[PDB]
Design a protein around this ligand. Structure first.
Ligand SMILES: *[C@@H]1O[C@H](CO)[C@@H](O[C@@H]2O[C@H](CO)[C@@H](O)[C@H](O)[C@H]2NC(C)=O)[C@H](O)[C@H]1NC(C)=O
Ligand SMILES: *[C@@H]1O[C@H](CO)[C@@H](O)[C@H](O)[C@H]1NC(C)=O
Ligand SMILES: *[C@@H]1O[C@H](CO)[C@@H](O)[C@H](O)[C@H]1NC(C)=O
Lengths: 197, 91
Protein backbone atom coordinates (compact mmCIF):
# COMPACT_ATOMS: atom_id res chain seq x y z
CA UNK A 1 0.00 0.00 0.00
CA UNK A 2 1.13 3.66 -0.42
CA UNK A 3 1.39 4.11 3.37
CA UNK A 4 3.45 0.88 3.61
CA UNK A 5 6.37 2.00 1.34
CA UNK A 6 6.26 5.40 3.08
CA UNK A 7 6.18 3.63 6.44
CA UNK A 8 9.23 1.76 5.18
CA UNK A 9 11.60 4.65 4.40
CA UNK A 10 11.15 6.63 7.60
CA UNK A 11 7.96 8.36 6.50
CA UNK A 12 5.42 7.98 9.29
CA UNK A 13 1.89 9.37 9.42
CA UNK A 14 1.10 10.23 13.02
CA UNK A 15 -2.59 9.74 14.10
CA UNK A 16 -4.82 12.81 14.22
CA UNK A 17 -5.25 13.60 17.89
CA UNK A 18 -9.04 13.59 17.50
CA UNK A 19 -10.50 10.44 15.99
CA UNK A 20 -13.42 10.80 13.60
CA UNK A 21 -15.74 9.51 16.31
CA UNK A 22 -14.63 12.42 18.47
CA UNK A 23 -15.08 15.02 15.73
CA UNK A 24 -18.55 13.56 15.29
CA UNK A 25 -19.32 14.38 18.90
CA UNK A 26 -18.32 18.03 18.48
CA UNK A 27 -20.13 18.46 15.19
CA UNK A 28 -22.97 16.78 17.03
CA UNK A 29 -22.75 19.11 20.02
CA UNK A 30 -22.49 22.35 18.05
CA UNK A 31 -25.23 21.01 15.83
CA UNK A 32 -27.31 19.91 18.80
CA UNK A 33 -26.74 23.17 20.61
CA UNK A 34 -27.70 25.32 17.67
CA UNK A 35 -30.97 23.44 17.26
CA UNK A 36 -32.26 23.64 20.82
CA UNK A 37 -30.40 26.43 22.54
CA UNK A 38 -30.32 29.07 19.87
CA UNK A 39 -26.96 30.76 19.50
CA UNK A 40 -26.59 31.57 23.18
CA UNK A 41 -24.30 28.66 23.95
CA UNK A 42 -21.40 30.42 22.28
CA UNK A 43 -21.86 33.36 24.64
CA UNK A 44 -22.44 31.37 27.81
CA UNK A 45 -24.80 28.79 29.23
CA UNK A 46 -27.00 27.25 26.56
CA UNK A 47 -30.62 28.36 26.81
CA UNK A 48 -33.34 26.00 25.69
CA UNK A 49 -35.64 27.96 23.40
CA UNK A 50 -38.36 26.65 21.07
CA UNK A 51 -36.71 26.24 17.70
CA UNK A 52 -39.72 27.66 15.88
CA UNK A 53 -39.11 30.74 17.98
CA UNK A 54 -35.38 30.72 17.30
CA UNK A 55 -36.24 31.32 13.67
CA UNK A 56 -38.45 34.24 14.64
CA UNK A 57 -35.20 35.80 15.78
CA UNK A 58 -32.93 34.83 12.92
CA UNK A 59 -35.36 36.59 10.62
CA UNK A 60 -35.04 39.78 12.64
CA UNK A 61 -31.36 39.28 11.97
CA UNK A 62 -32.03 39.57 8.24
CA UNK A 63 -34.60 42.33 8.63
CA UNK A 64 -37.68 40.20 7.93
CA UNK A 65 -40.28 40.79 10.61
CA UNK A 66 -41.03 37.56 12.46
CA UNK A 67 -44.74 37.69 11.63
CA UNK A 68 -43.66 36.21 8.29
CA UNK A 69 -42.36 32.96 9.90
CA UNK A 70 -45.30 32.05 12.23
CA UNK A 71 -47.63 32.47 9.23
CA UNK A 72 -45.36 30.82 6.67
CA UNK A 73 -43.95 28.26 9.11
CA UNK A 74 -45.24 25.20 7.25
CA UNK A 75 -44.19 26.50 3.84
CA UNK A 76 -40.76 27.23 5.28
CA UNK A 77 -40.58 23.70 6.66
CA UNK A 78 -40.97 21.95 3.32
CA UNK A 79 -38.65 24.46 1.68
CA UNK A 80 -36.09 23.61 4.33
CA UNK A 81 -36.73 19.87 4.41
CA UNK A 82 -36.72 19.53 0.63
CA UNK A 83 -33.62 21.71 0.31
CA UNK A 84 -31.95 19.19 2.60
CA UNK A 85 -32.98 16.35 0.32
CA UNK A 86 -31.31 18.08 -2.61
CA UNK A 87 -28.01 18.08 -0.72
CA UNK A 88 -27.92 14.32 -0.38
CA UNK A 89 -28.72 13.81 -4.08
CA UNK A 90 -25.88 16.20 -5.02
CA UNK A 91 -23.32 14.33 -2.85
CA UNK A 92 -24.70 10.93 -4.06
CA UNK A 93 -23.32 11.66 -7.54
CA UNK A 94 -20.94 14.62 -7.00
CA UNK A 95 -17.25 13.81 -6.80
CA UNK A 96 -16.32 17.45 -7.48
CA UNK A 97 -17.93 19.37 -4.61
CA UNK A 98 -15.29 17.79 -2.37
CA UNK A 99 -12.57 18.83 -4.81
CA UNK A 100 -11.22 21.21 -2.19
CA UNK A 101 -10.72 18.33 0.24
CA UNK A 102 -9.81 15.77 -2.41
CA UNK A 103 -7.13 18.14 -3.71
CA UNK A 104 -5.58 18.60 -0.27
CA UNK A 105 -5.38 14.86 0.31
CA UNK A 106 -3.96 14.43 -3.19
CA UNK A 107 -1.30 17.14 -3.08
CA UNK A 108 0.17 15.65 0.09
CA UNK A 109 0.35 12.09 -1.20
CA UNK A 110 1.67 13.63 -4.40
CA UNK A 111 4.64 15.33 -2.75
CA UNK A 112 4.87 12.27 -0.53
CA UNK A 113 5.17 10.07 -3.61
CA UNK A 114 7.68 12.38 -5.28
CA UNK A 115 9.60 12.43 -2.01
CA UNK A 116 9.83 8.65 -2.23
CA UNK A 117 10.78 8.46 -5.91
CA UNK A 118 13.71 10.72 -5.11
CA UNK A 119 15.19 7.70 -3.34
CA UNK A 120 15.59 6.04 -6.74
CA UNK A 121 17.48 8.90 -8.41
CA UNK A 122 21.20 8.84 -9.09
CA UNK A 123 21.71 12.55 -8.32
CA UNK A 124 24.91 12.15 -10.31
CA UNK A 125 26.24 9.36 -8.12
CA UNK A 126 26.92 6.00 -9.73
CA UNK A 127 23.81 4.41 -8.24
CA UNK A 128 20.75 5.20 -6.15
CA UNK A 129 21.21 2.21 -3.85
CA UNK A 130 23.27 3.19 -0.83
CA UNK A 131 25.01 -0.12 -0.20
CA UNK A 132 25.58 -0.96 -3.86
CA UNK A 133 27.89 2.02 -4.08
CA UNK A 134 29.77 0.72 -1.05
CA UNK A 135 30.34 -2.91 -1.96
CA UNK A 136 31.40 -1.83 -5.44
CA UNK A 137 34.14 0.56 -4.33
CA UNK A 138 36.59 1.07 -1.56
CA UNK A 139 35.01 3.45 0.93
CA UNK A 140 37.41 6.41 0.49
CA UNK A 141 35.70 6.72 -2.89
CA UNK A 142 32.24 6.09 -1.43
CA UNK A 143 32.73 9.07 0.89
CA UNK A 144 32.77 11.12 -2.31
CA UNK A 145 29.79 9.45 -3.97
CA UNK A 146 27.57 9.31 -0.89
CA UNK A 147 27.84 13.09 -0.90
CA UNK A 148 26.03 13.27 -4.22
CA UNK A 149 23.48 10.94 -2.66
CA UNK A 150 23.18 12.94 0.55
CA UNK A 151 23.47 16.30 -1.18
CA UNK A 152 20.70 15.07 -3.43
CA UNK A 153 18.41 13.52 -0.84
CA UNK A 154 19.01 16.17 1.81
CA UNK A 155 17.98 18.74 -0.77
CA UNK A 156 14.94 16.72 -1.81
CA UNK A 157 13.82 16.82 1.81
CA UNK A 158 14.29 20.56 2.11
CA UNK A 159 12.27 20.90 -1.05
CA UNK A 160 9.54 18.68 0.37
CA UNK A 161 9.76 20.25 3.81
CA UNK A 162 9.69 23.84 2.58
CA UNK A 163 6.69 22.78 0.53
CA UNK A 164 4.81 21.47 3.56
CA UNK A 165 5.47 24.66 5.51
CA UNK A 166 4.01 26.72 2.68
CA UNK A 167 1.17 24.26 2.21
CA UNK A 168 0.64 24.13 5.97
CA UNK A 169 0.09 27.88 6.09
CA UNK A 170 -2.37 27.53 3.22
CA UNK A 171 -4.40 25.13 5.34
CA UNK A 172 -3.58 27.38 8.35
CA UNK A 173 -5.41 30.37 6.74
CA UNK A 174 -8.26 28.00 5.67
CA UNK A 175 -8.45 26.63 9.28
CA UNK A 176 -8.65 30.26 10.57
CA UNK A 177 -11.51 30.89 8.06
CA UNK A 178 -13.27 27.70 9.31
CA UNK A 179 -12.92 28.91 12.95
CA UNK A 180 -14.31 32.32 11.81
CA UNK A 181 -17.28 30.65 10.11
CA UNK A 182 -17.76 28.13 12.89
CA UNK A 183 -17.68 30.99 15.37
CA UNK A 184 -19.70 33.60 13.51
CA UNK A 185 -21.91 31.64 11.15
CA UNK A 186 -22.93 28.61 13.26
CA UNK A 187 -22.68 30.07 16.82
CA UNK A 188 -24.02 33.44 15.70
CA UNK A 189 -25.94 34.88 12.80
CA UNK A 190 -23.61 36.62 10.40
CA UNK A 191 -24.53 40.15 9.41
CA UNK A 192 -21.61 39.93 6.99
CA UNK A 193 -22.88 39.55 3.43
CA UNK A 194 -21.97 36.47 1.37
CA UNK A 195 -19.61 35.31 4.05
CA UNK A 196 -22.01 32.46 4.79
CA UNK A 197 -23.12 32.16 1.15
CA UNK B 1 21.48 -21.45 0.40
CA UNK B 2 20.36 -20.63 4.00
CA UNK B 3 17.16 -21.73 5.79
CA UNK B 4 14.36 -19.18 5.22
CA UNK B 5 13.02 -17.15 8.23
CA UNK B 6 9.23 -16.61 8.61
CA UNK B 7 7.55 -13.96 10.87
CA UNK B 8 10.88 -12.64 12.18
CA UNK B 9 13.05 -9.69 11.19
CA UNK B 10 15.78 -11.03 8.93
CA UNK B 11 18.37 -9.72 6.58
CA UNK B 12 17.99 -11.60 3.34
CA UNK B 13 19.13 -12.31 -0.18
CA UNK B 14 16.93 -13.91 -2.84
CA UNK B 15 18.57 -14.60 -6.20
CA UNK B 16 20.90 -11.70 -5.50
CA UNK B 17 18.05 -9.38 -4.56
CA UNK B 18 18.93 -8.04 -1.12
CA UNK B 19 17.10 -6.14 1.56
CA UNK B 20 15.81 -6.43 5.10
CA UNK B 21 12.25 -7.19 6.03
CA UNK B 22 9.71 -9.47 7.67
CA UNK B 23 8.98 -12.39 5.37
CA UNK B 24 5.46 -13.80 5.54
CA UNK B 25 3.08 -16.00 3.61
CA UNK B 26 1.13 -13.96 1.08
CA UNK B 27 -1.74 -14.71 -1.28
CA UNK B 28 -0.88 -12.32 -4.11
CA UNK B 29 -0.59 -14.42 -7.25
CA UNK B 30 2.30 -14.12 -9.70
CA UNK B 31 2.53 -14.98 -13.32
CA UNK B 32 4.97 -17.89 -13.62
CA UNK B 33 7.94 -16.25 -15.35
CA UNK B 34 7.90 -13.37 -12.88
CA UNK B 35 10.35 -12.77 -10.07
CA UNK B 36 9.66 -9.71 -7.92
CA UNK B 37 6.57 -8.00 -6.87
CA UNK B 38 6.63 -4.24 -6.38
CA UNK B 39 4.56 -1.50 -4.81
CA UNK B 40 3.59 1.98 -5.99
CA UNK B 41 6.83 3.41 -4.60
CA UNK B 42 9.27 1.17 -6.54
CA UNK B 43 10.12 -0.62 -3.31
CA UNK B 44 10.51 -4.38 -3.40
CA UNK B 45 7.21 -5.42 -1.81
CA UNK B 46 6.85 -9.15 -2.45
CA UNK B 47 9.25 -11.82 -3.64
CA UNK B 48 8.93 -15.45 -4.58
CA UNK B 49 11.09 -18.03 -2.86
CA UNK B 50 13.22 -19.62 -5.66
CA UNK B 51 13.63 -23.15 -4.15
CA UNK B 52 9.96 -23.60 -3.08
CA UNK B 53 7.75 -21.32 -5.12
CA UNK B 54 5.77 -19.24 -2.67
CA UNK B 55 4.71 -15.62 -2.52
CA UNK B 56 6.59 -13.95 0.31
CA UNK B 57 5.80 -10.43 1.41
CA UNK B 58 8.56 -8.11 2.49
CA UNK B 59 7.68 -5.72 5.29
CA UNK B 60 10.82 -4.09 6.69
CA UNK B 61 10.97 -4.36 10.44
CA UNK B 62 8.73 -1.89 12.22
CA UNK B 63 10.11 1.34 13.59
CA UNK B 64 8.71 4.50 15.09
CA UNK B 65 9.45 7.58 17.10
CA UNK B 66 10.01 7.07 20.77
CA UNK B 67 7.91 9.58 22.68
CA UNK B 68 8.71 10.27 26.31
CA UNK B 69 5.48 11.22 28.04
CA UNK B 70 6.19 13.04 31.25
CA UNK B 71 4.56 15.46 33.63
CA UNK B 72 6.91 18.32 34.43
CA UNK B 73 10.19 17.14 35.88
CA UNK B 74 8.96 19.45 38.63
CA UNK B 75 6.26 17.04 39.79
CA UNK B 76 8.03 13.75 39.11
CA UNK B 77 10.98 11.89 37.67
CA UNK B 78 8.66 9.21 36.32
CA UNK B 79 8.15 8.84 32.58
CA UNK B 80 5.82 6.73 30.47
CA UNK B 81 7.36 5.91 27.12
CA UNK B 82 5.24 5.62 23.99
CA UNK B 83 6.66 3.57 21.16
CA UNK B 84 4.74 4.88 18.19
CA UNK B 85 3.14 2.59 15.64
CA UNK B 86 4.41 -0.82 16.72
CA UNK B 87 2.57 -3.86 17.95
CA UNK B 88 3.72 -4.62 21.47
CA UNK B 89 6.35 -7.33 21.14
CA UNK B 90 9.59 -5.77 19.89
CA UNK B 91 9.99 -3.95 23.18
C1 LIG C 1 -44.63 31.29 -2.16
O1 LIG C 1 -44.01 30.34 -2.99
C2 LIG C 1 -44.33 28.99 -2.64
C3 LIG C 1 -43.52 28.11 -3.56
O2 LIG C 1 -42.13 28.26 -3.32
C4 LIG C 1 -45.83 28.75 -2.76
O3 LIG C 1 -46.12 27.47 -2.22
C5 LIG C 1 -46.74 26.64 -3.21
O4 LIG C 1 -48.09 27.00 -3.42
C6 LIG C 1 -48.75 26.19 -4.40
C7 LIG C 1 -50.13 26.77 -4.60
O5 LIG C 1 -50.14 27.75 -5.64
C8 LIG C 1 -48.78 24.74 -3.93
O6 LIG C 1 -49.37 23.93 -4.93
C9 LIG C 1 -47.36 24.26 -3.63
O7 LIG C 1 -47.40 22.96 -3.07
C10 LIG C 1 -46.68 25.22 -2.67
N1 LIG C 1 -45.31 24.81 -2.43
C11 LIG C 1 -44.87 24.36 -1.25
C12 LIG C 1 -43.43 23.98 -1.18
O8 LIG C 1 -45.62 24.26 -0.28
C13 LIG C 1 -46.60 29.79 -1.97
O9 LIG C 1 -47.99 29.69 -2.25
C14 LIG C 1 -46.13 31.19 -2.32
N2 LIG C 1 -46.81 32.18 -1.51
C15 LIG C 1 -47.05 33.42 -1.95
C16 LIG C 1 -47.78 34.31 -1.00
O10 LIG C 1 -46.71 33.79 -3.07
C1 LIG D 1 6.61 23.35 40.54
O1 LIG D 1 7.43 23.35 41.70
C2 LIG D 1 7.32 24.57 42.45
C3 LIG D 1 8.31 24.48 43.58
O2 LIG D 1 9.61 24.15 43.11
C4 LIG D 1 5.87 24.77 42.92
O3 LIG D 1 5.77 26.05 43.54
C5 LIG D 1 4.90 24.68 41.75
O4 LIG D 1 3.56 24.69 42.22
C6 LIG D 1 5.15 23.42 40.94
N1 LIG D 1 4.28 23.37 39.78
C7 LIG D 1 3.35 22.43 39.60
C8 LIG D 1 2.54 22.53 38.33
O5 LIG D 1 3.15 21.54 40.42
C1 LIG E 1 -0.37 -7.68 17.48
O1 LIG E 1 -0.09 -9.06 17.40
C2 LIG E 1 -1.08 -9.88 18.04
C3 LIG E 1 -0.59 -11.30 17.91
O2 LIG E 1 0.82 -11.41 18.11
C4 LIG E 1 -2.45 -9.67 17.39
O3 LIG E 1 -3.42 -10.39 18.13
C5 LIG E 1 -2.80 -8.19 17.38
O4 LIG E 1 -3.99 -7.98 16.64
C6 LIG E 1 -1.67 -7.39 16.76
N1 LIG E 1 -1.97 -5.97 16.77
C7 LIG E 1 -1.42 -5.11 15.91
C8 LIG E 1 -1.83 -3.68 16.05
O5 LIG E 1 -0.62 -5.48 15.06
Amino acid sequence: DLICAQKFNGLTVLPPLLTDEMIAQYTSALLAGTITSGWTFGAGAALQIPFAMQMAYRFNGIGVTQNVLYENQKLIANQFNSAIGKIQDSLSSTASALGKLQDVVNQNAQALNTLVKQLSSNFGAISSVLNDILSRLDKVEAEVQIDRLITGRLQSLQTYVTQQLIRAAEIRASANLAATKMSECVLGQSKRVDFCG
Amino acid sequence: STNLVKNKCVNFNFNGLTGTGVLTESNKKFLPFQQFGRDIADTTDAVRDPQTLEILDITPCSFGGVSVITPGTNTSNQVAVLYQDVNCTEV
